Write a protein that binds this ligand. Structure first.
Ligand code: ADP
Ligand code: ADP
Ligand code: MG
Ligand code: MG
Ligand code: MG
Ligand code: MG
Lengths: 466, 466
């Protein structure tokens, strides 16, 4: 048999699939470096499917530190431990249990996990490649080197640094952190000269969030070109957006594409829905693939899952927004299984343990029996039909209801879940920590699923305290 | 700090106290040799309070072996692994986590745990002493040697072996297994000569239950004198029974008594209630102590908790029924904490880790603010007011209700729990796998608590399908 070590923490392939998928085929062992990062339902899936579990004991100081929260937007809690230490912890756990492989669904641990794998002679992302995938400046340089759509980009520390960039890069302009997630601090520029009395506010805002002491950024911000979208050169119907993600496996340095996902449009920069698989035509998908191939091999990644965001630009130029050496979040990975029957968690484990003896698809998965959409509603969506006032520093919610007749064609609601009756929702916090409803749709016609979603976003009834 | 390894399985100090008590003061690590022995609520308390958990992985063959039952009467499941193997497993886990101590609440693991502790140089029961406490014949010989009430006793294998015993020991006569728990096969003899066409039925019945492959019995049965009780030489009021248990800690070979428990009377040989602490007078308790001191030092036990059952015989002779080198079961250990504020789980851990530097009471705990009673109702109790027919191979239950006005004096019901509406109860199974209700009473007058219990057993309303 084979023993897989999982560094268990937030994001990526969700726990409700990951542990069962892994334990089906492997002896699963869990390391939990951040016990506070672990929801109650998460802990329960860890304990249920792992033959062994270790938590970093330094975290527990009283009995109440043994409490599991119901939900965690982000680990807003100091992890004051340098990278070399994390690596050591991982190596130690892997040796204690004779791990044949190490994976993680959490970005924060990708770098250190690569280092341990190399030291242990196990398959991994590759030490340098993981560095590249974790510093945005290094990720950019590598992409340019790899020959995918190349754009201007400067490291940014001060405002004195901000001037030289704004002047060079121009409008539209993106400035964002080198190391963080959930699009925090990621700032847009359509006005030309307010940027300054607006860079100095988002310079501070990065000093309230928390990451571990183990993610190296050689400069705090990057500035680079905003990738302009051109919806009409790509999609043939309304309902999607001008970006996509594609999911893949890297095996032995080679990129294997699995599935591309369509999106419904964002709100600000918060994502709303992921549709499995894309309706995009085969030529378009071939360009998307080709670009993710170059990007990811361009990082040097060896053995890992990938999640790559690509902006659909004019002339069908695919523009690399970002790639990570871990599974997509939300429900994308489960939905790939439901549609095609392929379990990408298992597939990656087969790669970590057996290399190209794993059964990797030859090209994107095809012959989808139907489309599955992973969708979320947010407060903004309702404020986007009036339901919320613009002074309303909070609101409380009793029910969210989907009237009948919104579904187009054979679309169908598979599941739906609303936030708890009496739920306190402060409306001066980011929306991507603020999903107040969640639904899945199935259907054999993509444009209608997509349209059915627009309709739910429009007409779903909130009942709440104004 | 200090790392305690718990071999987690059934019985003893119940999980709802043990893990929280241990984790309060120690870094707790759990080994689970029998994952099937672990209820859902148990697993959840393990994962919540342990900094590390290992399960014996050989048990998992499909995904469904990862299911936790709600309740487990007994681990009716083959554990085909010889003692030397268990020992090895325990030693390996203790080394993997640098355990400073090992404990268990489950009798089946006492012998092997002593061996590992000795090999590891950690405090324990003592290898021979644990053997003595686990083979009933060896426990008897040791008690006789120790000078506590001595009685006739022969090893029994066949019926040819049964003849020589019955003739020597006489009526009343007890014959029971050397190695099992919950009073299975424990058989009474008031008739003189039916015993034979009744020994040959209870010879077979031991071959349906299961124990691990790691408990040595050099003869399958023992026969010995039934210890006759004489209630009236001990208690001054009605309501108790003619046996007691006493709870203690062995530290460095010396017995430290903690608390004696009264009982309400049994049904068959199933226990009904445990009252913390005994109302027995100080001379009576001094005899009880003195007898448990000799018994337990007589076993040679070094470092462990003890639970010792003593029969209250005529002339105030305390008769040793049995002693185990682990905590009492049911809720006796929690109730000791509630009454006196002493946490005996912690106290034992302090002994395992620090020896007589622990804070051991000097004599039984006194100054009880009040009595707490841990009580259970069974089917028989209701069949003991008609509620069940004598053909009724099963019954289903909707509610069990305590009418008002049954409580005497300032007695009070603290908690009460009935079996689930629609619960299937086969009435050709042992009653001590069959608790269908559970209550706790508090009160400052013992005789009334005891009497309040009799009244609940009498008059509690069942509503069920006849
Ligand atoms: N350079 C860019 N050009 C266009 N859109 C971007 C750019 N960077 C970020 N975005 C938008 O914001 C989202 C978050 O970007 P990303 O850099 O992936 O931040 P995060 O790490 O928080 O996901 C992207 O999916 C994209 O829609
Ligand atoms: N030798 C005995 N004399 C009197 N009663 C006994 C004897 N052995 C067992 N019993 C009764 O049956 C119960 C179970 O006995 P024990 O030997 O402790 O079996 P178990 O290991 O199942 O608890 C005792 O608490 C006692 O009430
Ligand atoms: Mg990201
Ligand atoms: Mg991103
Ligand atoms: Mg017993
Ligand atoms: Mg007993």
């Amino acid at each position: 048999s084979k023993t897989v070590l999982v560094i268990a923490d937030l994001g990526g392939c969700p726990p409700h699939m990951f542990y069962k998928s892994a334990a089906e085929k492997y002896n699963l062992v869990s390391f939990i470096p951040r016990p506070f990062a672990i929801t109650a339902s998460h802990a329960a899936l860890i304990e249920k499917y792992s033959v062994a579990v270790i938590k970093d004991k330094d975290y527990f100081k009283s009995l109440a530190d043994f409490e599991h929260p119901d939900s965690i937007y982000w680990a807003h809690e100091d992890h004051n431990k340098p990278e070399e230490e994390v690596v050591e912890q991982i190596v130690k756990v892997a040796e204690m249990f004779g791990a044949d492989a190490i994976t993680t669904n959490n970005e924060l641990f990708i770098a250190p996990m690569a280092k341990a794998c190399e030291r242990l002679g196990l398959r991994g992302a590759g030490v340098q490649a993981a560095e590249n995938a974790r510093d945005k400046n290094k990720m950019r340089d590598a992409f340019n080197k790899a020959g995918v759509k190349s754009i201007k980009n400067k490291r940014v520390t001060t405002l004195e640094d901000f001037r030289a960039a704004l002047e060079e890069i121009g409008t539209p302009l993106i400035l964002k952190p080198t190391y963080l997630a959930s699009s925090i601090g990621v700032t847009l520029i359509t006005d030309t000269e307010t940027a300054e009395d607006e860079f100095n506010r988002v310079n501070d805002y990065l000093k309230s969030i928390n990451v571990p002491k183990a993610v190296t950024f050689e400069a705090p911000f990057i500035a680079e070109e905003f990738l302009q979208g051109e919806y009409g050169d790509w999609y043939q119907t309304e309902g999607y957006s001008d970006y996509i993600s594609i999911e893949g496996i890297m095996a032995d340095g080679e990129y294997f594409p699995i599935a591309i996902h369509d999106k419904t449009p964002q709100i600000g920069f918060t994502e709303t829905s992921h549709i499995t698989p894309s309706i995009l035509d085969e030529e378009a998908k071939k360009k998307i693939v080709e670009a993710a191939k170059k990007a990811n091999e361009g990082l040097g990644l060896q053995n890992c899952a990938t999640h790559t965001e690509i902006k659909l630009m004019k002339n069908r130029e695919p523009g690399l927004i970002e790639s990570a050496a871990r599974f997509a979040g939300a429900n994308m990975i489960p939905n790939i299984k439901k549609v095609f029957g392929l379990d990408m968690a298992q597939l990656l484990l087969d790669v970590l343990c057996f290399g190209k003896d794993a059964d990797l698809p030859d090209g994107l998965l095809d012959q989808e029996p139907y489309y599955v959409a992973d969708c979320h509603l947010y407060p903004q969506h309702f404020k986007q039909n009036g339901q919320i006032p613009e002074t309303a520093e909070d609101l409380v919610i009793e029910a969210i209801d989907i009237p009948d007749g919104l579904l187009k064609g054979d679309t169908e609601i598979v599941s739906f879940s609303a936030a708890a009756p009496g739920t306190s929702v402060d409306l001066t916090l980011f929306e991507a920590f603020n999903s107040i409803a969640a639904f899945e749709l199935k259907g054999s016609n993509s444009q209608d699923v997509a349209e059915s979603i627009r309709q739910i976003q429009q007409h779903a009834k909130l009942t709440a305290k104004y």
